[PDB]
């Protein structure tokens, strides 16, 4: 393999770190391969789930004790602090509010949460490289709790960082706020594509096409498909009940991307940094819920 930057995976890693039975499991929790059969059981279906009070309260909760657990993660970032110990805080602090890491064993994903530094797209498996002053991390968490997922990611500074790096970190939240500023029922979700786009090529960035936003519930993924780039052929049109979430992945450089022989770490081919924001929305009669917002504060932890 030829490593596209100067990031390379850190091993051994820790053994895998055990869930007490207490708490309740995904269906691909304990299959040897991780594939979840109520997914492949939905595959293939473009029905966009209208959810129930019941649904919606359910998503509430777990998006809201996600966004806990990504503030845990937020409050660890400073150079020398290993992505691994950073999963292992976050796996503790999924257990201490009765949630599955819904990463842990999904396809074999290995570890807790998603740590992407630099030229990390996204899924980084964390591991034991230490933080280093001037890298851009995102953390993006996944809890399950009483049978919903909910998701959630932001790109944190590891104390200083140049300029390139505010600006691209900058210009990816704005790309992600002007998405959620334009969903109410009647909007096209391909035309979130064409506003991220817009923005991102305005300040000399590039939309990675390979991962999309993803409708989430009682499935990890689902309809809709949400590409954050231009002209995208999306299906669907939003309505009120929907739930979804909008994920722009923004580069530096290009947007080609490739993935890791570990078959997760997704990585811009060029090696050149990429960011992201994501939050899970809901769609409601006036707009959108942000079910994982920060509820503390008005802005994202790199805003500090
Ligand atoms: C729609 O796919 C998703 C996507 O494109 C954006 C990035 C991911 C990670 O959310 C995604 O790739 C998922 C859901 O397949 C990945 C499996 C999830 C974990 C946490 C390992
Ligand atoms: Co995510
Ligand atoms: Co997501
Ligand atoms: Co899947
Ligand atoms: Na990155």
Redesign the pocket.
């Known amino acids: 393999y030829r490593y596209t930057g100067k990031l390379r995976p850190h091993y051994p890693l820790m053994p895998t770190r055990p869930v007490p039975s207490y708490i309740q499991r995904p269906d691909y929790a304990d299959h040897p391969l991780g594939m979840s059969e109520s997914e492949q059981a939905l595959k293939g279906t473009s029905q966009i789930k209208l959810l129930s009070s019941e649904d919606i309260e359910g998503m509430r909760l777990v998006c809201r004790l996600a966004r806990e657990v990504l503030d845990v993660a937020a409050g660890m970032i400073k150079p020398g602090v290993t992505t691994e110990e950073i999963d292992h805080a976050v796996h503790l602090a999924c257990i201490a509010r009765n949630c599955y890491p ?2 842990l064993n ?2 074999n ?1 290995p570890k807790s949460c ?1 740590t992407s530094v630099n030229e990390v797209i ?2 980084g498996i964390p591991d034991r490289r230490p933080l280093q002053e001037g890298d851009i991390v995102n953390v ?1 968490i ?1 809890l399950y709790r009483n049978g919903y997922h909910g ?1 959630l990611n932001e790109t944190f500074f590891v104390g200083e960082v140049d300029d390139g790096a505010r600006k691209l970190v900058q210009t990816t939240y704005e790309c992600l706020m002007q998405a959620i500023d334009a969903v109410k029922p009647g909007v096209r979700y391909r035309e979130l594509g064409n506003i991220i786009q817009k923005h991102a090529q305005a300040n000399g960035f590039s939309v990675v096409r ?5 409708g989430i519930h009682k499935l ?2 689902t309809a809709p ?1 949400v590409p954050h780039y231009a002209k995208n052929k999306a299906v669907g049109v939003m309505k009120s009940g929907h739930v979804f ?1 909008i ?1 722009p992945m923004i580069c530096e450089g290009g947007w080609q991307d490739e993935t890791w022989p570990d078959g ?1 770490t997704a990585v811009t081919r060029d090696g050149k940094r990429s960011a992201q924001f994501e939050h899970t929305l809901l769609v409601t009669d006036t707009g959108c819920e942000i079910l994982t917002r920060r509820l503390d504060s008005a802005r994202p932890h790199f805003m500090s």
């Open positions: 819904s990463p999904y396809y994903f998603c996204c899924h993006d996944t998701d390979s991962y999309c936003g993803h990890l993924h498909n979430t994920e997760w």
